[PDB]
Amino acid sequence: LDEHYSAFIDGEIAAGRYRSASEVIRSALRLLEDRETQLRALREALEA
């Protein structure tokens, strides 16, 4: 937990986009997982 990231999380909860710190992080991890999955899928498709 860093001051820039705690502040961004607090600010996201205050806007009513998320209800808890865990929710923000889960949401951020979902975005990263999807991105990395799309790119691996494009990468492996090219290797084929």
Partner 1 sequence: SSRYLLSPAAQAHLEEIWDCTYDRWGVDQAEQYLRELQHAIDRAAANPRIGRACDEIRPGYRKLSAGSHTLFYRVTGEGTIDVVRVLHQRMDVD
Q: Residues interacting with a copy of itself, by CB under 8 A? A: 1-6, 8-10, 12, 15-46
Segment 3 to 22, residues that bind partner 1, using CB under 8 A: none
**Which entry of a copy of itself, partner 1, none binds 14, CB below 5 to 8 A by partner kind?**
none
| Tokens of residue 14, six digits | 């205050």
39 contacts partner 1 (rule: CB under 8 A): yes
CA of 22: how far to CAs of 1, 29, 32, 35, in Å?
A: 12, 10, 15, 20
d(CA 41, CA 39) in angstroms, rounded, equals 5
29 contacts partner 1 (rule: CB under 8 A): no
